[PDB]
Amino acid sequence: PLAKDKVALLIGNMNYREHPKLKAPLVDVYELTNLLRQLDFKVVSLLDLTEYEMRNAVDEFLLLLDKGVYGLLYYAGHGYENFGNSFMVPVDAPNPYRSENCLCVQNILKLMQEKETGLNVFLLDMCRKRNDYDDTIPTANIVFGYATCQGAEAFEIQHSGLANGIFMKFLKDRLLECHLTKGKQALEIRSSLSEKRALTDPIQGTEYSAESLVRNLQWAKAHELPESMCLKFDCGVQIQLGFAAEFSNVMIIYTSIVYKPPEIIMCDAYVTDFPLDLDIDPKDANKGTPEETGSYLVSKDLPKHCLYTRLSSLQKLKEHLVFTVCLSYQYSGLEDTVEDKQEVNVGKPLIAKLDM
Ligand SMILES: CC(C)c1c(NC(=O)Nc2cnc(-n3nccn3)c(Cl)c2)cnc2cc(Cl)nn12
Ligand SMILES: [Ca+2]
Ligand SMILES: [Ca+2]
Ligand SMILES: [Ca+2]
Ligand SMILES: [Ca+2]
């Protein structure tokens, strides 16, 4: 068959405020978005959403689900279940959980089933609490997937490894064209298909469509990365300031000295003074690999020799992304290093441009 569009939303919640902090979602969201973009999906990938951010994100995904489109929703993070109703827990949720602070899976699912979409895929990779087992209880083209592990230890053991994410295996094996570890865990996959649907089905391809143009530009607005800069410093140094997206809400910056002038024999440069809403620890800025910042991106896909800084949390940017690049310089016979600065405005990078 054909897809009228291919749209995907991936949420990975990790940095929980009142609950144990998970680690696996970063990896598996990155890997699955890589897969999905190779399958022609436009993808949003958001780490660490609070209830409000998470609800706004899901609502705009649901607003893109239209007659004939193929929609994938993926969640990883803490979940709970009560009485047949499963809940995705946002990172700001209190302890104990409540339904009031959480997004109910079944509500998203009944809204996905409403649309007359050509394929709905909804995959959940939940860490349950230890004792939170299933309860005693009494369409469109749909694939529902639901994985559980009991406890963060079992979750993080089973998700340890590269490439071994349950739903990425499932989609590769079953929707195109990892040892069992200790603990309690479960997988549920349910499907109802009128005809065969696959993620490799062509998009119904338009030369001349306003609707297609709107869909592409609405997503592309949320993914404008800053136009990489080279800063002139008046002492004759030039510092190159480069950018990369790791997620829709995570940007890596990389600073490098592109040259020193004749008179300067020692030079060093770095970034500081980021917006407070992003909560950047400066010990996790200015590192000598992007791996040291906590990025999936490596020093062999990002360019060499830079100081690397990871700006996560870009959806929390109230205003403009503004920072100071600092220079240290030392003249050919001088006893002391000179310091210099310039302030950079970087705009509203990535999902920060939605301004919500
Ligand atoms: C419309 C487009 C950008 C889009 C989404 N939109 C959002 O995720 N919107 C959002 C809206 N608001 C907040 N937010 N509220 C407060 C702080 N952050 C966030 Cl995180 C996300 C979501 N999923 C998809 C998939 C495709 Cl394909 N496109 N797309
Ligand atoms: Ca239960
Ligand atoms: Ca993994
Ligand atoms: Ca604002
Ligand atoms: Ca001095």
Curated annotation (Swiss-Prot):
Disease: Immunodeficiency 12: A primary immunodeficiency characterized by onset in infancy of recurrent bacterial and candidal infections resulting in bronchiectasis and growth delay. Manifestations include mastoiditis, aphthous ulcers, cheilitis, gingivitis, esophagitis, gastritis, duodenitis, and meningitis. Levels of absolute lymphocytes and serum immunoglobulins are normal, but specific antibody titers are low despite immunization, and T-cells show impaired proliferative responses to mitogens. A chromosomal aberration involving MALT1 is recurrent in low-grade mucosa-associated lymphoid tissue (MALT lymphoma). Translocation t(11;18)(q21;q21) with BIRC2. This translocation is found in approximately 50% of cytogenetically abnormal low-grade MALT lymphoma.
Compartments where located: Cytoplasm, Perinuclear region; Nucleus
Name by which UniProt lists this protein: Mucosa-associated lymphoid tissue lymphoma translocation protein 1
Residue ranges of the region described as Caspase-like: 11-201
Protein function: Protease that enhances BCL10-induced activation: acts via formation of CBM complexes that channel adaptive and innate immune signaling downstream of CARD domain-containing proteins (CARD9, CARD11 and CARD14) to activate NF-kappa-B and MAP kinase p38 pathways which stimulate expression of genes encoding pro-inflammatory cytokines and chemokines. Mediates BCL10 cleavage: MALT1-dependent BCL10 cleavage plays an important role in T-cell antigen receptor-induced integrin adhesion. Involved in the induction of T helper 17 cells (Th17) differentiation.
Residues included from the entire protein: 338 to 717 of 824
Motif (Nuclear export signal): 32-39
Binding partners and assembly: Homooligomer; forms oligomers which bind to TRAF6. Forms a complex with CARD14 and MALT1; resulting in the formation of a CBM (CARD14-BCL10-MALT1) complex. Forms a complex with CARD11 and MALT1; resulting in the formation of a CBM (CARD11-BCL10-MALT1) complex. Forms a complex with CARD9 and MALT1; resulting in the formation of a CBM (CARD9-BCL10-MALT1) complex.
